[PDB]
DNA sequence: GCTGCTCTTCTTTGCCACGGCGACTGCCG
RNA sequence: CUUCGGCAGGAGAGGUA
DNA sequence: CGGCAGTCGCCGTCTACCTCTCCAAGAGCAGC
């Protein structure tokens, strides 16, 4: 869906290519870890945040 | 599952003590939080009359709590009327440093 | 207990890390009770007890292999027993393959546990092999084991008293002449740092 | 919002069948905030006459 | 600021004189260092 | 159980320009 | 020659040249 | 190993004068 809708400009498709993120799990955890360094990486408190 | 140190206020050790209990009953934490012994000193205040012997905290500001793990525990014990935080930030606090394997008895005995 | 003046630690540049050759982050960790530091070492006992130490370690190391193969074999035995009961023919070999793979996986995790053990022991060893003054240890378990088993003939602490002990043994002349030599010969950013 | 915290805290300390609305409300923060705003503030000013 | 310094110094002194575990005295020493730093230059590190 | 004296301040929501210079620190090559 | 006895820090807002 | 470039943290930002108001609280612990 993201590549069907947000795909009329090379900006979006090029940012999509170099994303390196695949899986809402991986993504969510990446941001969870990012926000606060060195913290308990429980997915419950991630969806909470 | 072992013992942990908790920081209170100077003047709220027994209010915290009572609160932790009342809260352990007014929430539903009888399968998590366990005994909460604030180290006490029964130093007989000799008076030959009206006696003024009291708790006279040995560690003004700290209260020892025997709890379980997880995070709910943490939240309930920290958000109590009269506490200041935890004790054990010897490296991020990820694994809150517990009292050395054999150290509880050295306080509970006396 | 001793403390530290804020002017000579939090300034730019930090006049304490310029003297002890420590990064200011390490100073912030040591002073505010967040990491241990190695105040002094002694290579006398170290070199005069290498063989002995290594041998004693190896002796404890062998126990791991012992237990390892003990459970390994006992597993193999019971596994092949239940294979003779219901895996030699097509009685119920369907999920019996998974059954015996159960204990094969438990033997794989037995090897993973021998890995874990030998690994952490290797850590301890490599640590005690280097042990140089002014080296930070961030993990509490490593330092606790080091001071429990190899505590003597080595010292470490944390706080402002540790900084005081580090300054106590500091030899000004040697560091001054080393800096002057680096300035005289040797190019790059080392020139600027030595200046 | 300040008084709500005391109201919420007081529910885990008293006992049911003894909890009364006149026992959970502390009206001190509200009057303190009102008095602090109407005096000693940057927008309530001494009148020009 | 002098009052805070004296308070945490007499607390640390009593804890030490009785013989408390290492973690409590370490926390007290950290707090005393922070108080002294606030006395000399308030706001340099952390919150004022 | 009276009122004056005395002592003390950490989770939980608050938080709010612009140029110059130098240290530094992961980070790529 | 005159015995005791009697004071003045911060924060905010608005103005003048 | 060896450059290296973004980034962040600390420094500075005109002189003299006049008028007004406001400056912790909450909870525990006495000696009767």
From Swiss-Prot, chain A:
Question: Subunit arrangement?
Answer: The RNAP catalytic core consists of 2 alpha, 1 beta, 1 beta' and 1 omega subunit. When a sigma factor is associated with the core the holoenzyme is formed, which can initiate transcription. Interacts with CarD, TRCF (Mfd) and RbpA.
Query: What's this protein's family per the entry?
Result: Belongs to the RNA polymerase beta chain family.
Function text: DNA-dependent RNA polymerase catalyzes the transcription of DNA into RNA using the four ribonucleoside triphosphates as substrates.
Q: Under what name is this protein listed?
A: DNA-directed RNA polymerase subunit beta
* Phylogenetic classification of the source organism: Bacteria, Bacillati, Actinomycetota, Actinomycetes, Mycobacteriales
Q: Which residues of the full protein are shown?
A: 247 to 295 of 1178
UniProtKB/Swiss-Prot annotation, chain B:
Return the GO cellular component terms, semicolon-separated: cytosol
* Organism domain of life: Bacteria
Question: What keywords would UniProt list here?
Answer: Transcription, Transcription antitermination, Transcription regulation, Transcription termination
Q: Which GO biological process categories is it annotated with?
A: DNA-templated transcription termination; regulation of DNA-templated transcription elongation; transcription antitermination; transcription elongation-coupled chromatin remodeling
Q: Which family does it belong to?
A: Belongs to the NusG family.
| Function, as annotated | Participates in transcription elongation, termination and antitermination. Stimulates RNA polymerase pausing at U107 and U144 in the trp leader. NusG-stimulated pausing is sequence specific. Does not affect trp leader termination.
Q: What is this protein called?
A: Transcription termination/antitermination protein NusG
Indicate the span of the full protein covered.
3 to 112 of 177
Curated annotation (Swiss-Prot), chain E:
Oligomeric state and interaction partners are given as: The RNAP catalytic core consists of 2 alpha, 1 beta, 1 beta' and 1 omega subunit. When a sigma factor is associated with the core the holoenzyme is formed, which can initiate transcription.
**What is the covered span of the full protein?**
343 to 390 of 1316
**What triggers its expression?**
6-fold repressed by starvation.
Summary of the function given for this chain in its UniProt record: DNA-dependent RNA polymerase catalyzes the transcription of DNA into RNA using the four ribonucleoside triphosphates as substrates.
Instruction: Give the species.
Output: Mycobacterium tuberculosis (strain ATCC 25618 / H37Rv)
Q: What is this protein called?
A: DNA-directed RNA polymerase subunit beta'
- Which family would the database say this protein is a member of? Belongs to the RNA polymerase beta' chain family.
């Amino acid at each position: 869906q993201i590549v069907e809708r947000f795909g009329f400009s090379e900006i979006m498709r090029s940012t999509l290519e170099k994303d390196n993120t695949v899986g809402t799990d991986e993504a969510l955890l990446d941001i969870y870890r990012k926000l606060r360094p060195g913290e308990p990486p429980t997915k419950e408190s991630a969806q909470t945040l | 599952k072992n013992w942990y140190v908790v920081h209170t206020y100077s003047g709220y050790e027994n209010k915290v003590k009572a609160n932790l209990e009342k809260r352990v009953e007014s929430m539903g934490m009888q399968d998590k939080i366990f005994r909460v012994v604030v180290p006490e000193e029964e130093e007989t205040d000799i008076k030959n009359g009206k006696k003024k012997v009291v708790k006279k905290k040995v560690f003004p500001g700290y209260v020892l709590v025997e709890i379980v793990m997880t995070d709910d525990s943490w939240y309930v014990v920290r958000n109590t009327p009269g506490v200041t935080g935890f004790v054990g930030s010897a490296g991020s606090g990820s694994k809150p440093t517990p009292l050395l394997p054999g150290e509880a008895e050295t306080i509970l005995k006396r | 207990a001793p403390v530290t003046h804020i002017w000579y630690f939090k300034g730019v540049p930090s006049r304490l890390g310029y003297l002890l050759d420590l990064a200011p982050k390490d100073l912030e960790k040591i002073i505010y009770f967040a990491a241990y530091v190695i105040t002094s070492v002694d290579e006398e006992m170290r070199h005069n007890e290498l063989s002995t130490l290594e041998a004693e370690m190896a002796v404890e190391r062998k126990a791991v292999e012992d237990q390892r193969d003990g459970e390994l074999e006992a597993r193999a035995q019971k596994l092949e027993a239940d294979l003779a009961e219901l895996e030699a023919e097509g009685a119920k070999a369907d999920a019996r393959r998974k059954v015996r793979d159960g204990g094969e996986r438990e033997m794989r995790q037995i090897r993973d546990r021998a890995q874990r053990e030998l690994d952490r022991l290797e850590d301890i060893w490599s640590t005690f092999t280097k042990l140089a003054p002014k080296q930070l240890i961030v993990d509490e378990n490593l330092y606790r084991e080091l001071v429990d088993r190899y505590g003597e003939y080595f010292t470490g602490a944390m706080g402002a008293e540790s900084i005081q002990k580090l300054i106590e043994n500091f030899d000004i002349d040697a560091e001054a002449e080393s800096l002057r030599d680096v300035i005289r010969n040797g190019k790059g950013q080392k020139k600027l740092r030595a200046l | 919002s300040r008084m709500e915290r005391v109201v919420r805290e007081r529910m885990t300390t008293q006992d049911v069948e003894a909890i009364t609305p006149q026992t959970l409300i502390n009206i001190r923060p509200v009057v303190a905030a009102i008095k602090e705003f109407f005096g000693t503030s940057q927008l309530s000013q001494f009148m020009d006459q | 600021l002098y009052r805070r310094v004296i308070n945490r110094n007499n607390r640390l002194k009593r804890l030490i004189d009785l013989g408390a575990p290492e973690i409590i005295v370490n926390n007290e020493k950290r707090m005393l260092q922070e108080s002294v730093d606030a006395l000399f230059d308030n706001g340099r590190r952390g919150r004022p």
